[PDB]
Structures are given as structure tokens and as C-alpha cells.
Amino acid sequence: TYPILIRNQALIPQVAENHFVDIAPFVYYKDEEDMENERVITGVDRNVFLKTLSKFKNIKNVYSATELHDHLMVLLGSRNTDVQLDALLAYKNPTLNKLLDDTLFKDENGSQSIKAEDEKVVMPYVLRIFFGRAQVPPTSGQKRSRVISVLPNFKKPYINDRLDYNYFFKATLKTIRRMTGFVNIVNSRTNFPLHTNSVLQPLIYSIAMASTEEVHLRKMASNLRQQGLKCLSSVGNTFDWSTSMEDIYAVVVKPNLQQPSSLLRLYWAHNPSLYQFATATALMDQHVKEAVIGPII
Amino acid sequence: LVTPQRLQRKRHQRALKVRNAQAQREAAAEYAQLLAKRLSE
Amino acid sequence: LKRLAAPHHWLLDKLSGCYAPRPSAGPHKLRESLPLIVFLRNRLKYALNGREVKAILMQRHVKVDGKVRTDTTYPAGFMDVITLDATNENFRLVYDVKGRFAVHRITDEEASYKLGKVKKVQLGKKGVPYVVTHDGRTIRYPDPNIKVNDTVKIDLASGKITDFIKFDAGKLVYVTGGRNLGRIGTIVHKERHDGGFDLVHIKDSLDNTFVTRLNNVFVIGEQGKPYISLPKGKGIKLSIAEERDRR
Amino acid sequence: TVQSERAFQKQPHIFNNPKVKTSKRTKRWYKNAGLGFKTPKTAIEGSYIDKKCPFTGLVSIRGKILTGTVVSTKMHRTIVIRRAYLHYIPKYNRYEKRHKNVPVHVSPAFRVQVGDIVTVGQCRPISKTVRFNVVKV
Amino acid sequence: RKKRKFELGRQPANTKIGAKRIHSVRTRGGNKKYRALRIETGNFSWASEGISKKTRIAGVVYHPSNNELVRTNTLTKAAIVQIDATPFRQWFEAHYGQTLESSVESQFSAGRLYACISSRPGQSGRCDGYILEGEELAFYLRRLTAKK
RNA sequence: AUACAGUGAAACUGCGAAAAAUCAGUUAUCGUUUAUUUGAUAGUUCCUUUACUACAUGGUAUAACUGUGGUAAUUCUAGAGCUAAUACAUGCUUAAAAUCUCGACCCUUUGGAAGAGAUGUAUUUAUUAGAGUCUUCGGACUCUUUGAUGAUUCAUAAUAACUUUUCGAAUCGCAUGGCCUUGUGCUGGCGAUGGUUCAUUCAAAUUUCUGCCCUAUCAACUUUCGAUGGUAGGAUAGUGGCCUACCAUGGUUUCAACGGG
Q: What does the UniProt entry say about where the protein is found (chain E)?
């Protein structure tokens, strides 16, 4: 496979083999072979239209097999710049794929590819890692300084992570999606992002009530971030459709969530809470109960 | 080359770091009880 | 390799070539330590020449305060122990009435530990209190009643502290350095200037009220019950003329 | 008058917050010099800057404590001290007289009189020739 | 280590804005220094609320020891610079809810603020400034009147 | 011994070759470096991870070597191809983490715990902290929370970021042991090197003051091209006109400054 990809790099019939490879690349040693095939393919018409979307996925993310390889991001950006003002955006995005001064300079398809390559090259680089903290803060600063950008960021989060049963009511991929939802809500399309985050938190709650510590920490961080998101937003229909099963499972447990119950009860919030109702149990069952009682009264 | 020796050495390095951290976080708790009894007297 | 004016309490022979050994970096200073060459070559005479001293150091026979320290120019200075495993020997090197490094033959149950004066108590990193001592054993987590110019009792199996002698007015004291070397007794007066030149004054059998610098003194224990043994009648320096008048 | 230069007179790492309020305008920093030298309230509540003050600046007094008398105040923010110590060399067989001169840094929190007795401390180098510091008259 | 000589110096860094370059320089005894040459970006921090951000520096408008450094746009310590004001404005809108002090709310809609350099990028390796606010803002508005 | 194994040319590497004028001392470094030795020192590098991953450990770029010559000599050389690492340059560290709180509840605690919460270092800033009773007569009942210095803006912790980046072991010789899930499965010792920070050590650096010949038919010297201070900066391991700007015009001296041997 590596020898054949080297021969294809050494290369009509090449375009027909590129159409067959476009089928195989729309479908899916494999890492080095994919690197060699991308370096060959970055140097049809409808196969080109599908490959532009596949290269946009590879320059927006490296999600499934790897996690945000910079060589993969460079090869995907070279393929996208070979596919498709444009020169200035290409130079800024090439310096970004090469990040500090580029983010300071870049602080509509160019904007789509810009959010793509920015969250690709800083797609959760690590937890701290002595530079990943600064990289995650830089990506959050660029996402807050660049409404279409935040809409596309929530769109990419939902594109990572059917939906009908997920709105009505894969453990390792669910843990990765829960970490993705925690990282997305870590920032300083609202209905679709809230629906996807509620579906991820509910699936994490189900798979945790059924790796277990990973699901526990991810569900705890996601529930605290969901309370923070509802407090920073402040629609009651989807709000009730999300809160119903969660507070029902947390009926006996409520004797994060208590701060959400005390922050969603202080006029219109009082109507939103009385739409559900429990509250006397939250009051009776300590400063953590004293603040809730002497505020909720 | 991965001989049996090198991964034994890596195993010993990892267990060395964990055991040093274990002894240090035992000594910290011991000093905490000592400061507790120094408070109590 | 600068020499022939050594610290002259080493008492090396002057017709022994030209030079004199350079103590390397270590737990003690230059002119108040004693390397193992000067120890095992012209202080107790177990080895004739310096390369034979290197042979007995390389063959793991000697350990200073717990571990081997295979090194000729190792400045094993004051108050430590030297546990020669062969000859069953525990050389504690302490001071004398005249200014030299007197030797002992310590029992094993006393050679199992050593002591030493602290130099500072600090907060090192991540809010961890650590003390130092005079021989560089910066050890963590003391009892925080440890004050400056005080002595701890290092366990020498681990580096822990077993006990400490919280010095104040009136607990038995040693001296080190200065022209009042090798004296004991702590109870006349306790002077405290601002910038040194102060002592806890001394009281002996002849009750000689003596002083020196506070850097030149450190503690041992309780009066009459010391933690370390002391050589040749627990050195006093009464008088040699009075000694030749009586005996 | 306080400001006398193109640059603002800064005492760094200590600054007020505008949203909080007090009648001090800056959390003004002061320190006791040591060796029994006591800071005066005129030096405390004087809003002078003095980045080289041995009560409120950056320098710390240590070691030598000399005496002297003022011989001149004809330099900008530095004063000159005389020391006419009694001197004797056995070639003379008499108590002969010399004099010793030195420049000493001075603070705006203290009056200066040509003739009075000043107690001077040793500090870090401050100028090409000024090494000492006034601490107390 | 650490000999002495009689009288000489060295060439300064006298850095500019545009085409940020950092050249390391050898220091005897650890802490290998970095001369910034023509650095175009810097770390700038609010004093009161306490938020830093890396920000494209616009230009130094005042120097208190040589007026020619403002002409050549030299970034030394303790100068008066304009930057961007937009990420601090973004944090202000985000976490105060005002969505806009008086003499800095008047500078927000003007666009660029004034700040003071505190690092020495001729020797250290980076540039930081804090946005002047309070009596520093008072005397530096008086220094703007000293400009005009 | 079908990777090598003790022996070792050569070479790469690592380390070391560093006439108050001189000085003899004295003082500080709360004004710098701190290599070597010695003692403590660090679980965090991928999780937009199930179309699941370099860590049972990934890459060049070359010596010695082989080959072609020059040349008048050799401690002179140019070309080419090989091949190594503690050289050079990257780089993930498997109950993805792991530990302490709160521990309600039980069952009796020396627990075991569902879930409410946090977690490196280094660099450069800006802060903040850093200062009278009840009495089983036995004891308890709440007590007034911080290290040192003569002295701190010290030590240190947290806070919000920036890191052209730091480190957080891709190394080596000896034995080969315990386990049972008999798999090249899990673990395991002695100690060589390297590295973060602090202390000690020596070594360097300035700086304090006490001290040397003959002199006034030697009394003025120095601001030029900073001579003397301030303020800010450049610099520098670092204070400091050591230099750069603006302000002030000083300083030394007849007690012999300055000069003469």
C-alpha cells in the first residue's frame, strides 16, 4: 500500500484512479498511507466536489483516527488551496497552519475555512501540556473575537456529535463527544447546540447509570457547564423538554444542579421553575442549603 | 531494539516516580498531623 | 593545586613533598573540615601513602554517615560518623582541648545517628517548610518549633529527625571554632547584640565565664546528660601547669 | 510639589484600584530601616516618590553606621559630609588633625542644615561615588 | 567566569514595530537572554479588572527620555503606546454586561487606548504593557496636553 | 551464543585545559554568577480518540572506513558513497488520568462510600495575601489562622495571560527473581549518566573603611568628547554615568588637591 501510494505520487488514467481513490476516500499502515495519498492528491468535477468537502473535513478537523495532526492540517490546507482576496486569505491561513501573529492578524468561504483551520490546529491540543493551555485560550479568544463564526463552531461541534430518539429520551465515542461538549462549553445555532449538548449529557447519564469514572467526570463537567450556559443565556419549551428527565432522575439525588435550581428561580425564571413544580426538598436538604433557602424564599 | 531489558527499565522508571510520589504524599500527611498536635498543645 | 600552607590543625609532615591536599566541594567549609586522605594517612595511620588510601576508599570499606562516599578529597568535616565496617570502628571526629580533630571509638547504637546545628528554617516550594543544617542536609517537614541556631538529631537510616534540643537559657552546649575551642556548659549569661559578637556564656567545673561568636557555638543537650560522648575527660583545659603540679 | 520630570514618578508593584476608594490614593509602602532606626511620620505621609529612600524606596541599610557633619548642600538631591577625625602617627608625637569627605544620598523627607550632626548608614551603590545613605539626623 | 575590563559597551537592540524577530544572546551564568528586534505584538493587561491579552501594538506616541524614539517608533520600557482595545472591550462587554471608568469609556469608541511598557524587550525577550488607569491616566492625559 | 556480549586500533561523544597605584586586612552582596561535590527534589506531554491511536520506544547526518587525486614538502587537502549515539532534531507516556477534600447515609467505623469540587514547573508582567463558663473532676465547652530577617517589594501561595521555547529520562552495566491470567503476560533489585528548583560547598565578581617615600623658588585641578548629582532609559550575569537624553553647575583642595623622581 505504501509502495503503491509512492508510485501514485510518482505519477486521464491518473484521474480515473483518482476517482476510484475519491470513492475510497469518501468511504475512509493506514495513517502513513493516508498521509502519502494526501500528499499525492494535493499535487474531476463531481468527485472533485465530494473531495472538496472531504478536504474541508480534513482541514476543519482530524477527528476519528487521529487528533489534529499538523502535517495532516498542512496537507489538507494545501489540497483546499489547490482546489479553490483569495490570495490574502490563503497567505493568512497558511501562516495560521504554520499561530500567534496569524491569530492577531485574523482577529465568507474564507471565514468558513478560517474557523475550520483555526479549530483544527487548536482542536483541543491537550489538557495543559505547558502550551496547550495557551493554545486553548488562543482558540477561545479567536472564537470570541471573530455570529457566523460561533454558529459554525457549534455546527462543527454538532457535526462531531438518532437525533429524534436523542431529543425524545458507543461508550468511548460518547466519552470523546462528552469531552468535546465540555470543551465547546468551555468557551466564554443555539437551539441545535443546546439540543446536541442535552442529548450528550442524557446519553452520558444513561451510560453512567448503566471508563465509568471518565463518564462520571465528563457528565459532571457537562452538567456544570450546562447550568452555566443556562445562567449566561436566561424559550421554555425545549428548556422543559431537556430539564424533565434530568430533574426526574435527580429527584431523590437533589436532597451545580442545586445552583441551577436556585438560579432558575429568581419572575420569568419563577414561572419556568413552576412550570415543572421537590422545591421544599431542595430547601430542607449547611451554607449550601442556607443560601438556597434564604434566596428562594 | 526492544530487548527485554529496556521495557524493564521503563517499568522501573515509572514505578520509581510513583513510589517517590507515594512517600512524599505520606510525609505531607504526617507533617499535617504534627501541625495538628502542635495546634492542640 | 595550591598548597603548603594548609590549615595547620591538620598537622601534616612538612618533609612530605611540597603540596597538601585540596578538599573538594562538600558539606563543610575549607579550613574547618578534614578529608579522608589526612585522616587515613597521617592522623591514625592505617594506610601509608595516598594511593593506598585510594585503594581502601575504592574497596568500599569506609562509609561516612551511612553511605560509602568513595572519594579521596571528600571533606567529611565536623560531627559526622565514619563507620569502618571492618575493624568494627565508629570514628566520630570531634574537637579537642587544643584545636585538633580528636577521634572516638563510638558504640554502634550511638553511631546510628548524628546531630548538627541548623542554619535556617525556610519555606522551599509549594509551601513546604524545610530546615537546613551545617552539613548541607536540607531536610523537609520539621517540627515548626525549630528555631535558628538549634540542633536536630538526624536518624541516619532515613534523613528524618528523631529529637531536637530547643536551645534557650541553660542547656548543655559545645563550641567550635575560635580560640576558646572545646568547652562545655552554657549557664552564666546570654548576650544578644544586633549583628553578631554575642554568646551564651559558659560555665564549667572551674566556672570559666567565656564567650565567642554565636556562629562559633552549637548545642548538645541537657546538663550532665549529653547526646555525644567527648574525648579525654570531656575536654576542659584546666591547666597543664596545674596538672603537673597535682599529678 | 511632587512631579518634576518628563516621566511619571513611579513606585512599581504597588498601585491603587480606581473602583475602591481611600484617602491615600495609592497603598503607600514604607519600611523600618533596622538597627533601631525608626521611620518618621513625615516620611510616611509625605507623598514624595524617592525610589532610593531607605524607608520607602528600594534600598535597604546594613552594616556600617558612621557619624558626620554637613559641609555643603550644593548638589541636586545629594549632600556632602565631612569627618575630621583625630589622627596620630608616631613620626609626629602629637595629636594631629586630618579630615575625611564623602558624598551621601539625601531624601526629601528630611530638613538639611549646614553644620548639624548627621548619622549615616551604609547601603548599596547609588551613584558613581555615592555609596552611603542618610537614615537619621 | 566574571572577569573585569576598563571601558567599553555594546550595540543596543532599539527595536521597532513590524516583522517581529527574536535573537537569543549568550549570558554568562544561566538565563540566556533574548533581544527582540522589530517586534510587532505584545502582552497588554488591564490594571483594575486584571485581564491580559496578546495584542497587536499600534505605535508608541510618547517617550519620556528621548523624543526621537517616538519618531523612529522605538519600543523601550515606560512608553505610551496605542494597541487595539478590542479584546479588552470584548471581555468588558462579556463579563460586565454594560455593552459599551468615564475617561476609558471615552477612549473605547475612539478606538485605541494608552498603556505603559514594563518589560525591557531590548534585553528580556518580550514586551508587556499595562493600560494606564487612575492618576497615571490623569498625568498621562496631561502629557497628551504636553504633546499638543 | 544467527543482534551484540570479556579483548581492543581508529574516530564520534562527554569533561578539563581561563608611589592610596599593587596590596595586607576589614564590611556587605536584602547589588550578581553559583559550573563541580553533597542533601532534598516531578504521576499532568494524546482524549473535534470507536471506521482506536508511533511508546514493546519513531527520524536524519555524518566521523573513523572505502575510493579518486593534487602536492615541492606535511599537524595541507577536494570530490563521492556507506554506518552509530547520553551527537543533532523531534516526540507520546494506558484502572486517561490519579490524589485529597464534603463526606449525607449506613454500621458501627481505624470504615465504604453514591456524587457536590480541585490538581505541574519555567519565562515576562499586573495584582492580592505575605499581619467567660459547663464541669462525671478526668477534662471539656471554639478558639482569636501563618516562616525568617535589625530590616523588606524577602521566602512562598493564589489570581489573569503571554510563552518562536524550558524541563517533566526514546540512555547504560550487572543479576535474572516473585506471581499465574504459561503469555515472550504481569511485576522486580543494585547504581552509571542526564535534567527542574532550593540549600551547602568551593571559585569568581564588585563594594566598605585602617594603613606607605621626598616635596608649595610644586596651588589650583577638572566640565573637552558627562566634570559633579537628579530622573527615565539603553545595558549587564550586575548596582553604578558604565553609556544615551533633559534638568542642576558642580566636585577636589592649602590639613598640601595637582604635578614632579
A: Cytoplasm
